C-alpha cells in the first residue's frame, strides 16, 4: 500500500504518459499496488498519478454497482452534451466534498493490463467515476471542475449524519 | 469561545447586515467573543459570520497590523494594482490558496463605540482587511481562486 498524494503535490498536476507495453510484470505490479491502496482506503477508484506514477492507468469498481475495471490509455467521448451535478470526494482531497457537473452519458475506450481493448458506454455514477479518474490523468482534481463554490466544503459540515 | 463555522456551513455564504446601534452591551459582548475565539485559534482576523452572527463586524491585528475593530466597513481601491499571495482561513482549516488582492486600499468604518475609522493600507494589511470584509458578503477565499493549481493542503505546499 503506497501513500496517496494530497492536493498541493505537483505530481497530481501532470499529464500522464501512455503505457507502451502491456502484459509486463511491472504493469501487473502497478495494478496490484493500486488495488491494494484503493481497497485499503475504501475508494471507488484510483489513478496512478495519485501514488506518484505518471502513467495513464486507472482502476475503479465497487459493489450503484460499478464494474471492477483496469483502464489504460483511456479516451472519453460524451454521448450527449447533457450534464448532471453530483457530489464528489477524492482520496487526494481528504475531508472535503464538492458538487461537480459531469456528462450524464459517455463512451469510453482503453485497454486492460493484458492489452485487450475496452469499449463501453456508461451513464450516471459509472460515467462519473470514469470521468473523475481520467481527470487525474490530465492533472485535474475535482476542485478544478467546481463552478459553484457554495457547494464545496467539509464532509462533516455538508453531511452531519 | 464560540465555535468557528467551517466551509460548507450556509451561514458563511450570506450578506451581513449593518450594525444599527453602537456602544451597546450586546455589541461589546460580540467583540469580546470574537477576540476570544480568534485568539484561541491563533488567527490574524475574524469576521462575525464565522461565529454565526450575520453582522458587519470584523476584527484584525497581528509593519505590524494594528489591533482593530471595524464595523460597517467600506473598501475603496487606491489603484487597480493587484498582487497574488497565499491565504488561509480559520473556516477552511488545513488548506492554502493563492489569491489576488488589491495592493493598496483605503477603508472606512467605525469602532464599537461608533467612532469613525479611516485608513490607507497596503500589502498584508490590505490583504487581511479585504479577506475579512469578503466574509461579510458571503465570500470565502476559494471563491476568489481562479487557478486551483495554486490550492492545496498546507503541510504539502509548505513542508
Ligand atoms: C464520486 C466520484 C469519485 C469516485 C472516486 C473517489 C476515489 C478517488 O480518489 N479517485 O481518484 C472516491 O472513492 N470517492 C468517494 C466518493 O466521492 N463517493 C463515494 C460514493 C459517493 C461519493 C460521495 O458522494 C469517497 C471515498 C470520497
Ligand atoms: C492571510 C489572509 C487571511 C488573514 C485572516 C485569517 C483568519 C480568518 O479566517 N479571518 O477571517 C488568518 O489568520 N489566516 C492565517 C493566514 O492565512 N496566514 C498567516 C500569515 C500568512 C498566511 C498564510 O499564508 C492563518 C491562520 C491561516
Ligand atoms: Fe480522486
Ligand atoms: Fe477567513
Ligand atoms: Mg438597519
Sketch out chain A's domains with CATH numbers.
1-161 (3.90.45.10)
Pick the closest to residue B57 from B41, B26, B34 (CA basis).
B34
- Cα distances from A114 to residues A25, A61, B55, B155, in angstroms, run 10, 18, 62, 39
* Ligand sitting nearest the alpha carbon of A128: 1
Nearest-neighbour CA in chain A from B58: distance (Å): 21
- Cα distances from A52 to residues A11, A33, A95, B147, in angstroms, run 6, 12, 21, 22
Find all residues with CB under 8 Å of A64, minimum gap 6, and list them: A124, A125, A126
- Cα distances from A65 to residues A41, A159, B90, in angstroms, run 18, 22, 38
Determination technique for this entry: X-ray
Burial B96-127 (b: 16+ CB within 10 A, else e): bbbbebbbbbebebbebeeeeeeeebbeebbb
B128 lines ligand 2 (CB under 6 A): yes
The C-alpha atoms of residue B133 and residue B70 are separated, in whole angstroms, by 9
Place of cell 482502476: A59
Resolution reached, in Å?
Answer: 2.0
Residue B21, SS3 per DSSP = coil
Pick the closest to residue B89 from B6, B158, B152 (CA basis).
B6
* Ligand 1 atom at minimum distance from A87 CA: 24
The DSSP result for B109-147, as a single string, is EE-TTS-EEEEEEEHHHHHHHHHHHHHTBT--GGGG-S-
Residue B62, SS3 per DSSP = coil
Residues A153, B9 contacting (CB under 8 angstroms): yes
* Ligand sitting nearest the alpha carbon of B140: 4
The C-alpha atoms of residue A102 and residue A104 are separated, in whole angstroms, by 6
- Cα distances from A25 to residues A19, B49, B120, in angstroms, run 13, 56, 65
Verify whether the Cβ–Cβ distance A6 to B152 is below 8 Å.
yes
B132 is catalytic: yes
Burial B13-39 (b: 16+ CB within 10 A, else e): beebeebeeeeeeebeebbebbbebbe
The C-alpha atoms of residue A84 and residue B120 are separated, in whole angstroms, by 46
Residues B97, B86 contacting (CB under 8 angstroms): yes
Residue of chain A whose Cα is closest to the Cα of B4: A157
Q: Is A34 left (phi over 0), alpha (psi -120 to 50) or beta?
A: alpha
Mutational pocket test of ligand 2: of B2, B44, B91, the residue with most ligand atoms within 8 Å of the beta carbon: B44
The C-alpha atoms of residue A136 and residue A132 are separated, in whole angstroms, by 7
- Cα distances from A105 to residues A72, A83, A120, B88, in angstroms, run 20, 8, 11, 37
A87 lines ligand 1 (CB under 6 A): yes
The C-alpha atoms of residue A47 and residue B119 are separated, in whole angstroms, by 51
Find all residues with CB under 8 Å of A161, minimum gap 6, and list them: none
What's chain A's Rg over C-alpha atoms?
15
Q: Which residues of B touch A148 (CB under 8 A)?
A: none
- How do the residues of chain B divide into helix, strand and coil, expressed in percent and rounded to 5? 30, 35, 35
Q: Whose CA is nearest to atom 1 of ligand 2?
A: B87
Marked catalytic residue, from B29, B36, B122, B132: B132
User: Is A40 annotated as ligand-binding?
Assistant: no
Find all residues with CB under 8 Å of A29, minimum gap 6, and list them: none
User: Beta strands of chain A (E only): which ranges?
Assistant: 45-47, 57-62, 66-78, 83-88, 96-103, 105-111, 117-123, 152-154
The C-alpha atoms of residue B66 and residue A38 are separated, in whole angstroms, by 49
Verify whether the Cβ–Cβ distance B8 to A143 is below 8 Å.
no
Provide the pairing of β-strand A105-111 with A117-123: antiparallel
Residues A122, A84 contacting (CB under 8 angstroms): no
Q: Where are the alpha helices (DSSP H) in A96-136?
A: 124-136
Sheet holding B68-77, edge to edge: B45-47, B57-60, B68-77, B104-110, B116-122
Amino acid at each position: 500500500i503506497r501513500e496517496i498524494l494530497k492536493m498541493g503535490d505537483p505530481r497530481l498536476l501532470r499529464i500522464a504518459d501512455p503505457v507502451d507495453h502491456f502484459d509486463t510484470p511491472e504493469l501487473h505490479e502497478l495494478v496490484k499496488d493500486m488495488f491494494e491502496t484503493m481497497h485499503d482506503a475504501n475508494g471507488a477508484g484510483l489513478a496512478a498519478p495519485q501514488i506518484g506514477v505518471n502513467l495513464q492507468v486507472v482502476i475503479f469498481g465497487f459493489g450503484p454497482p460499478v464494474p471492477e475495471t483496469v483502464l489504460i490509455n483511456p479516451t472519453i467521448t460524451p454521448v450527449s452534451q447533457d450534464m448532471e451535478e453530483g457530489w464528489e470526494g477524492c482520496l487526494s482531497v481528504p475531508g472535503l466534498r464538492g458538487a461537480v457537473s459531469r456528462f450524464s452519458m459517455i463512451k469510453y475506450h482503453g485497454f486492460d493490463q493484458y492489452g485487450k481493448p475496452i469499449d463501453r458506454v456508461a451513464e450516471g455514477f459509472h460515467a462519473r467515476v470514469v470521468q473523475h479518474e481520467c481527470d487525474h490523468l490530465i492533472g485535474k482534481l475535482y476542485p478544478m471542475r467546481i463552478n459553484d463554490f457554495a457547494k464545496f466544503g467539509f464532509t462533516e459540515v455538508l453531511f452531519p449524519d
